[PDB]
Structures are given as C-alpha cells and as structure tokens.
Amino acid sequence: MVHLTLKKIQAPKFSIEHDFSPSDTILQIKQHLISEEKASHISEIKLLLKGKVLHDNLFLSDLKVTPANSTITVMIKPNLE
C-alpha cells in the first residue's frame, strides 16, 4: 500500500492520511473528498505533488509518488454559496 497524505490548503482545509493502491486512480481520491463533504465536484479539484501536477485519470504508478514527500496538496473550488 502507498501512503498518501492529503493536505488541503484552501477552505474547507484538512489533512487526512490514507493508504492507496499502486494502480489506484486519482479519481478515487476526488470521489472520497466529495463523499466526505469536503469537495463539490471532481471537475473543480486538482492535486499537487511538490510542484508535480496530477491528472484525474492518472495512476500512482504513472505520476510516481515520491517517498521523500508522500504529501499531496488538495486544491478545490467551492461551488456551494
């Protein structure tokens, strides 16, 4: 299992630690954020990995989760007024 720490800067902010699969998709993360009432739509979400940008249908084995980081910055735009 790969350790991924989700660190959301913008409000609502949060920092959750979870284990994902090597063949896991970033889409799963996005869905999890919405299911936790932390995100509005997947379309308004972008994950940052120490400068390195991640894509919606991207896989952890593609972007390569750097062990020297394991920190994923969560960027979301609220659609709810």
């Binding site: 800067i9 913008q10 972008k46 940052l48 940008v53 960027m75 735009k77």
Partner: protein
C-alpha cells in the same frame, strides 16, 4: 539584505503575470492551468484577491528590489 521589495507587491505581480500569460497562451496547456491554480493558492496564502492587482501594483513603476544577496550571477 537591502531587499526593498514588498511581499504584497510580488504576490500581486505573480497573479498579474500569470493571468496575462494565460491570456495570450504564452505557455503549455497544463502549464497555464498550473499557473492559475498556484495563483489562486498564492492569493489565499497572502490573504489578497487576484483581482486586486491594480490596487497594489498599479503603474507606479513597481521595482521589486530583491537581490536576495545573490552575487553568484556567474
């Protein structure tokens, strides 16, 4: 040391520059997207609005004097 560049000035310059860069698409597609998202977060980091550019910078010749004591130019 003698860096007379204000953070608010630089911050506004960053968001200003990025916006004008995506305007003429002077960079890669995802590159522009990255600049936009970084700009948004930077605005939050400094607690200022991206649209406040003209309020902070304006046109008073924003000379961001920030050498960072770099004498290793060559």
């Amino acid at each position: 040391s003698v860096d007379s560049a204000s953070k608010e000035e630089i911050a506004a310059l960053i968001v200003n520059y990025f916006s004008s860069i995506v305007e003429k698409k002077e960079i890669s597609e995802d590159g522009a997207d990255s600049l936009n998202v970084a700009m948004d977060c930077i605005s939050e980091a400094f607690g200022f609005e991206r649209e406040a550019v003209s309020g902070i910078l304006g046109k008073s010749e924003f000379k961001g004097q920030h050498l960072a004591d770099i004498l290793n130019s060559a």
